[PDB]
Amino acid sequence: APKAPADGLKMEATKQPVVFNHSTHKSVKCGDCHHPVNGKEDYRKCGTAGCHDSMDKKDKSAKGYYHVMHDKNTKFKSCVGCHVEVAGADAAKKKDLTGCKKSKCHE
Ligand code: HEC
Ligand code: HEC
Ligand code: HEC
Ligand code: HEC
C-alpha cells in the first residue's frame, strides 16, 4: 500500500530501454502490472534474481523476461497485450503501440 511514485521511471536492463510513466497508466489496477507473487503483492524489479531472469530470444516460459512484457497468451497481462487489445481499432497506432520500430516503447 505504497504511493504511486512520481513519473521518471524507465526500464533499460536489456539492450532495449523503455520508459513508462504511471501517469499514462494510472487508470489500471496495480495488480495488472504488479501481480501477486508467492502470495504477496510484488512491486520489485520485474526481472530481479529469482524471478524473470530469462533474457534470450527464443526460450519462453513464465521465466521469460520478454515473455512477461510482450506475449498475450500469459496468465497475466503484458505491455504489448493490453496495447493489442487497445490498438486493435486502427492499423496506424498498431505501429506505435505494438510497433517494433518507432514505437513509443522501442522509439
Ligand atoms: C515489436 C512487436 C516488438 C519487438 C520486436 C520487441 N518488443 Fe519490446 N520491450 C518492452 C519492454 C518494457 C522491454 C523490457 C525492458 C528491459 O527489461 O530492459 C522490452 C524488451 C524487448 C526485447 C529484449 C528482451 C531481452 O532481454 O532479450 C526485445 C528483443 C524486444 N523487446 C522486442 C516494451 C515493449 C512495448 C511497449 C508496450 C512494445 C509495444 C514492445 N516492447 C514490442 C516489441
Ligand atoms: C503497468 C501498467 C503498471 C501499473 C498499472 C502500475 N505500475 Fe507500478 N511500476 C511499473 C513498472 C514497470 C515499474 C518498474 C519496474 C521495472 O521494470 O523497472 C513500476 C514501479 C513501481 C514502484 C517502484 C518499486 C518500489 O520501489 O516500491 C512502485 C512503488 C509502484 N510501481 C507502485 C504502483 C502503484 C501504487 C500502482 C497503482 C496505484 C502501480 N504501481 C501501477 C508498472 C506499473
Ligand atoms: C518474482 C518475485 C517475480 C517478479 C519480481 C515478477 N514476477 Fe512475473 N511471475 C512470477 C512467477 C513466479 C510467475 C509464474 C506464475 C504464473 O502466474 O504463471 C510469473 C508470471 C508472470 C507472467 C505470466 C507469464 C505466463 O507465461 O503466463 C507475466 C506476464 C508476468 N509475470 C509479468 C510480470 C511483470 C510485468 C512484472 C513486473 C511488474 C513481474 N512479472 C514481476 C514471479 C515474478
Ligand atoms: C492496459 C492494461 C495496458 C498495459 C498493461 C500497458 N499499457 Fe501502455 N498504454 C495503455 C493505453 C490505454 C495507452 C494509451 C494509448 C493512447 O495514446 O491512446 C498506453 C500508452 C503507452 C505509451 C505511450 C505514452 C503516451 O502516449 O502517453 C507507452 C510508451 C506505453 N503505454 C508503454 C507501456 C509499457 C512499457 C508497459 C509495460 C511496462 C505498458 N505500456 C503496459 C494501456 C496499457
Side-chain angles (χ1 to χ4, degrees):
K3 262 183 108 234
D7 326 310
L9 114 77
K10 77 278 136 288
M11 316 142 82
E12 62 134 320
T14 82
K15 304 211 218 213
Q16 359 279 345
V18 177
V19 92
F20 146 95
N21 340 89
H22 278 95
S23 86
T24 62
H25 301 81
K26 85 196 142 211
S27 214
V28 165
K29 223 197 193 198
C30 323
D32 205 305
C33 265
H34 304 286
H35 73 59
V37 211
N38 307 132
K40 160 190 81 152
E41 266 162 83
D42 179 71
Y43 276 61
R44 318 184 231 157
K45 313 221 207 100
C46 286
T48 352
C51 315
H52 310 281
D53 74 330
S54 156
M55 302 169 151
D56 187 19
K57 194 202 94 282
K58 257 156 110 92
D59 161 14
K60 313 191 280 245
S61 210
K63 277 131 252 276
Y65 192 27
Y66 160 100
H67 158 89
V68 291
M69 14 194 97
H70 294 86
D71 253 18
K72 71 126 169 158
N73 281 14
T74 49
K75 188 90 262 153
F76 305 135
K77 315 229 155 107
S78 81
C79 301
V80 174
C82 197
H83 282 211
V84 172
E85 249 306 291
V86 177
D90 202 351
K93 214 192 297 315
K94 94 88 149 270
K95 223 88 226 219
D96 318 39
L97 314 193
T98 67
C100 284
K101 159 53 123 48
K102 207 162 114 267
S103 172
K104 263 79 122 106
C105 309
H106 298 291
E107 230 233 44

